[PDB]
Design a protein around this ligand. Structure first.
Ligand SMILES: Clc1cc(Cl)cc(-c2cc(CN3CCN(c4ccncc4)CC3)cc(CN3CCN(c4ccncc4)CC3)c2)c1
Ligand SMILES: *[C@@H]1O[C@H](CO)[C@@H](O)[C@H](O)[C@H]1NC(C)=O
Ligand SMILES: [Ca+2]
Ligand SMILES: [Ca+2]
Ligand SMILES: [Ca+2]
Ligand SMILES: [Cl-]
Ligand code: NA
Ligand code: NA
Ligand code: NA
Ligand code: NA
Length: 472
């Protein structure tokens, strides 16, 4: 195997590193996997389809302009180069290799398109037409953005976009399911908590956070239990950043944020899908859980879950490992059909006050076709009133003892509107047996005399009843 000769490939430290602080992508390339036959689409502000490092891989069938309602996602050029982000993300996935231009994509033989959707009013319909673009041609969708990362917003897909997610994972990709890769958010300096973003908090999105070059949680990162894994991105001014294609046929070394991590994950997923085209949308999440690596990622919340895997709310299961992903994909056995066990917990409304604990012992649909002994995602769907939402912190403890933070205190969130059946999701109990006692904790983290009521707590368990590995 000959590594790429592109002039900035040596600067792509998160791929070309020889110091074990990288995504282990050369190992996948050397196994023969470069993304051939895989189609990825960037949902963003457009794609410079004539970029010298993108044109060779550009796919019109992976592209559309839902802002202006035409097939051509070319960005709108402005003096400030506002609409450059989709071009940066496209190159992360699939910049051409060995062509003397810039660097390379993770999946440098994949086909790449873009949906121009963010350069205009983003409506539910715009979102749905983007998520649902050509779902039997595009394999993988990469989305780096969502509701405002101001640390006070609670919002998610409205009806058309949610329908697009379910149609995507159910009938997309020949029934194997569209793979939606999502950035978990850039709201760290606002103390944002990313389960409040219903796109990344979805089970249907494979959510990705960031690590800095020296292995730290970047200033912009949001912690939450819905995140699955991590890719490198930017940090402080002594740490390197992401090197990729830029608007106006240029090359940037200063692409940043969690919004730069999701495209790198999308490229690794493209390599993995080349290694096994029969993987389902859930298979792909299982592979990420099993192969991602905590080592050398610094956080104070690494915890071992019930099946022996380390998990963090900043990093999920750790750094994506492309070589391990493609290796495990090759002989992967398709997971069993997804079961869903619905457990309505409360028999009466519960005053929250300063602190509320709700304990319930469940059988996880014992005796029924939705019996789950092997958890995937779990949700605590909560309906509650509170006078100042951001003073709440919420935790969910599984029978195996795994404490998931569902909501951290958000100091800017002054809302008096509470949560209306909000489906806080955790990935941290993946592969655990969910039978037993679950504990929900709701706490007022402020000294104020805050008040409210929990009126509904639905525990929703997803998973299967077969195929478990010996704990790690
Ligand atoms: Cl599918 C998909 C893929 C992607 Cl990548 C994003 C969304 C995404 C975007 C936004 C729009 N932002 C402004 C434009 N951005 C830029 C970021 C960086 N630089 C420049 C612009 C991104 C963030 C918002 C919502 C939330 N969404 C909720 C449902 N909707 C409404 C609900 C109620 N009332 C009005 C509208 C529409 C808005 C999602 C959805
Ligand atoms: C894909 O997986 C399904 C489910 O296990 C199986 O029935 C089918 O034969 C597989 N197809 C290929 C081409 O491997
Ligand atoms: Ca256009
Ligand atoms: Ca190149
Ligand atoms: Ca956020
Ligand atoms: Cl469902
Ligand atoms: Na965001
Ligand atoms: Na997700
Ligand atoms: Na534990
Ligand atoms: Na149990």
């Amino acid at each position: 195997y000959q590594e790429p000769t592109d002039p900035k490939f040596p600067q792509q430290w998160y791929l070309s590193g020889v110091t074990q602080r990288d995504l282990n992508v050369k190992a996948a390339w050397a196994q023969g996997y470069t993304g051939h036959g895989i189609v990825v689409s960037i949902l963003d502000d457009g794609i410079e389809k004539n970029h010298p490092d993108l044109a060779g891989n550009y796919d019109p069938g992976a592209s559309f302009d839902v802002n202006d309602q035409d097939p051509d996602p070319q960005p709108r050029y402005t003096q400030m180069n506002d609409n450059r982000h989709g071009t940066r993300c496209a190159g992360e996935v699939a910049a051409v290799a060995n062509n003397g231009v810039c660097g390379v994509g993770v999946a440098y033989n994949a086909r790449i398109g873009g949906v121009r959707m963010l350069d205009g009013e983003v409506t539910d319909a715009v979102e749905a037409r983007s998520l649902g673009l050509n779902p039997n041609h595009i394999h993988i969708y990469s989305a780096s953005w969502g509701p405002e990362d101001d640390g006070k917003t609670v919002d998610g897909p409205a009806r058309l976009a949610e329908e697009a997610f379910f149609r995507g994972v159910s009938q997309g990709r020949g029934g194997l399911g569209s793979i939606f890769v999502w950035a978990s958010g850039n709201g760290g300096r606002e103390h944002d908590s990313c389960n409040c973003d219903g796109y990344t908090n979805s089970i249907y999105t494979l959510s990705i956070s960031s690590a800095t070059q020296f292995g730290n949680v970047p200033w912009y990162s949001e912690a939450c239990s819905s995140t699955l894994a991590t890719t490198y991105s930017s940090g402080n001014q002594n740490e390197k950043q992401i090197v990729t294609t830029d608007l106006r046929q240029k090359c940037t070394e200063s692409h940043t944020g969690t919004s730069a991590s999701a495209p790198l994950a999308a490229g690794i997923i493209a390599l993995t899908l080349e290694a096994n085209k029969n993987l389902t949308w859930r298979d792909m999440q299982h592979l990420v859980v099993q192969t991602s690596k905590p080592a050398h990622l610094n956080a104070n919340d690494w915890a071992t879950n019930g099946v022996g895997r380390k998990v963090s709310h900043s990093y999920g299961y750790g750094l994506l490992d492309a070589g391990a992903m493609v290796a495990l994909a090759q002989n992967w056995t398709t997971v069993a059909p997804q079961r869903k066990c619905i457990i309505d917990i409360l028999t009466e409304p519960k005053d929250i006050g300063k602190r509320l604990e709700v304990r319930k012992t469940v059988t996880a649909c014992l005796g029924e076709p939705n019996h789950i002994t092997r958890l995937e995602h779990a949700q605590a769907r909560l309906t509650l009133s509170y006078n100042r939402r951001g003073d709440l912190a919420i935790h969910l403890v599984s029978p195996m003892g795994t404490r998931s933070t569902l909501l951290a205190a958000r100091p800017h969130d002054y809302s008096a509107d509470g949560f209306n059946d909000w489906a806080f999701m955790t990935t941290h109990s993946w592969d655990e047996d969910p039978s037993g006692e679950w504990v929900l904790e709701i706490e007022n983290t402020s000294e104020a005399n805050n008040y409210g009521t929990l009126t509904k707590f639905t525990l929703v368990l997803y998973g299967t009843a077969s195929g478990s590995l010996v704990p790690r």
